[PDB]
Amino acid sequence: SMGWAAAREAAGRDMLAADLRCSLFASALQSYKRDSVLRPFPASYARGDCKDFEALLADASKLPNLKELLQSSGDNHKRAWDLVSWILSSKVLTIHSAGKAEFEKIQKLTGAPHTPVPAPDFLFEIEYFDPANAKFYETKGERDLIYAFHGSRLENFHSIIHNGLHCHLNKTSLFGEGTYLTSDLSLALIYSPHGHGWQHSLLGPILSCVAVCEVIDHPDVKCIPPKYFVVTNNQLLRVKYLLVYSQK
Numbered sequence: 574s575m576g577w578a579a580a581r582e583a584a585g586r587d588m589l590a591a592d593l594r595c596s597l598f599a600s601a602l603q604s605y606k607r608d609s610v611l612r613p614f615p616a617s618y619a620r621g622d623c624k625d626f627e628a629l630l631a632d633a634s635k636l637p638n639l640k641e642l643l644q645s646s647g648d649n650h651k652r653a654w655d656l657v658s659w660i661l662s663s664k665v666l667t668i669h670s671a672g673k674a675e676f677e678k679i680q681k682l683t684g685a686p687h688t689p690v691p692a693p694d695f696l697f698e699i700e701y702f703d704p705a706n707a708k709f710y711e712t713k714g715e716r717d718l719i720y721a722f723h724g725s726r727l728e729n730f731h732s733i734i735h736n737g738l739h740c741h742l743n744k745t746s747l748f749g750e751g752t753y754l755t756s757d758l759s760l761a762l763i764y765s766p767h768g769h770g771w772q773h774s775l776l777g778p779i780l781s782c783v784a785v786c787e788v789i790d791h792p793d794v795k796c797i798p799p800k801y802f803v804v805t806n807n808q809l810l811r812v813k814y815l816l817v818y819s820q821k
């Protein structure tokens with residue numbers, strides 16, 4: 574992962590996106606589902622197959638807010654810096670804070686909501702690097718891109734971002750067709766209840782998050798609105814935006 578000096582520069586460039594990643598990490602770690610949802614897991618807290626969640630929870634509770642972590646020297650918060658550097662490291666993607674120009678663009682690409690919806694408090698964009706970025710465009714070719722929503726519990730978003738949405742084909746189930754998406758934000762929001770984030774977060778301690786996916790228009794995508802649809806191949810979609818709602 575990144576060193577401390579590199580992480581300090583990466584966090585300083587976009588404090589709200591660094592905070593979102595710490596918040597989603599804290600949500601996944603605090604959940605009773607941490608064993609399955611805190612993936613990727615920081616290898617320094619594992620002894621082979623044995624994940625030391627008590628030591629990890631104990632060290633995550635020592636993280637100060639990001640402004641204080643940056644306002645102070647490195648050797649003041651050693652375990653904190655090692656953890657934050659790992660949280661902000663990825664060779665696959667990065668997250669950027671976005672504005673009203675990008676939210677207006679999302680509304681245009683998904684269509685005017687049929688039903689009243691709240692405006693998000695924060696909006697983030699996921700940028701992908703090669704080989705993942707070039708792989709997605711090679712799969713796309715000349716095909717059109719469709720934008721659709723996927724709601725989920727807050728504790729799933731650390732894993733959703735780094736591993737992608739599960740396209741789990743389960744023949745022994747009522748809901749094993751693949752990834753379920755909807756063109757309507759109001760339908761996705763009922764699947765995004767408010768969850769516990771990070772107490773020292775700039776975004777607030779209680780958040781709801783909705784994924785905006787970029788979907789390749791392909792026959793394997795089973796049906797700019799078209800109610801709710803199913804994606805059977807994980808190569809045909811990627812999470813592109815995160816709509817974040819902070820409970821006041």
Ligand SMILES: NC(=O)c1ccc[n+]([C@@H]2C[C@H](COP(=O)(O)OP(=O)(O)OC[C@H]3O[C@@H](n4cnc5c(N)ncnc54)[C@H](O)[C@@H]3O)[C@@H](O)[C@H]2O)c1
Pocket residue numbers: 610722723724725726729730732733734736737738739748751752753754755760761762764801
């Ligand atoms: N999710 C929505 O926005 C949405 C909207 C409208 C209808 N539905 C219906 C709800 C029902 C089953 O779908 P649903 O429960 O949403 O999906 P699911 O049954 O396919 O999966 C279970 C859970 O896994 C979550 N998940 C996906 N990828 C990951 C990952 N990498 N890490 C941790 N968690 C992950 C996912 O978000 C969902 O909550 C179908 O009838 C859907 O059409 C869902």
